[PDB]
Design a protein around this ligand. Structure first.
Ligand SMILES: CSc1nc(N)nc(-c2c(Cl)cc3c4c(cccc24)COC3)n1
Ligand SMILES: [Mg+2]
Length: 210
């Protein structure tokens, strides 16, 4: 069963701004997704201090970067807190706790897209480089779900089976044809060193088999 939802208007407008604004410094998407992963890891780390059983789904707190040139995807995986179905719909489909409104106003008053992470919406910078984003997530309190959107004002949510994660979130970027530089090992290493060198969890960049 696949459920289809409309983004809240302001989120659809934010997405359109990211997709349509001329902006060359696209590499910042990776820092933004790694920052979200680090925050999700801080959350499970903290919750586990008072409830160690929350790590029964995996004790290791880490981030993996997985390029795949055959599929033209870059995947950012973490073992963070993850999202229940409701968290997934609220966090990715609505303004919720984000600074969506403040960011859109800021862009009209001198700010630029690289500042997106100051407004709680850095995830949407994935649309600088991806034509489609799939988010697979597993929270201790729920089953595994897959969210997906190619923008255009809608997204889908369905249960995900056959490839269970212990806990965390996987952001799969289906790259635009002209954005394949983000699959190259030297490019990913350069961006991690420039923007994510102080993250407090291991970031492992996978090597390609062929
Ligand atoms: C809550 S667990 C989590 N893990 C990771 N890696 N990312 C997110 C996350 C995603 Cl996937 C997307 C959005 C988020 C927002 C806030 C906080 C976390 C997230 C709002 O923009 C969408 N949440
Ligand atoms: Mg802020």
């Amino acid at each position: 069963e696949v459920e289809t939802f409309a983004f809240q208007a302001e989120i659809a407008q934010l997405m359109s701004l990211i997709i349509n604004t001329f902006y060359s410094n696209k590499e910042i998407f990776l820092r933004e997704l790694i920052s979200n992963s680090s925050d999700a890891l801080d959350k499970i780390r903290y919750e586990s201090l008072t409830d160690p059983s929350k790590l029964d789904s995996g004790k290791e707190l880490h981030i993996n970067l997985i390029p795949n040139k055959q599929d033209r995807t870059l995947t950012i995986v973490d073992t963070g807190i993850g999202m229940t179905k409701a968290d997934l719909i609220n966090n990715l489909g609505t303004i919720a706790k984000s600074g969506t409104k403040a960011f859109m106003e800021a862009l009209q008053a001198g700010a630029d897209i690289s500042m997106i992470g100051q407004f709680g919406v850095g995830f949407y910078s994935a649309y600088l480089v991806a034509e489609k984003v799939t988010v697979i997530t597993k929270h201790n309190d729920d089953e595994q779900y897959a969210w997906e959107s190619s923008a255009g004002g809608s997204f889908t949510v369905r249960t995900d089976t056959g490839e269970p994660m212990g806990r965390g979130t996987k952001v799969i970027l289906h790259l635009k044809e002209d954005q394949t530089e983000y699959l190259e090992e030297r490019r990913i290493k350069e961006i991690v060193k420039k923007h994510s060198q102080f993250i407090g969890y291991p970031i492992t960049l996978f090597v390609e088999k062929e």
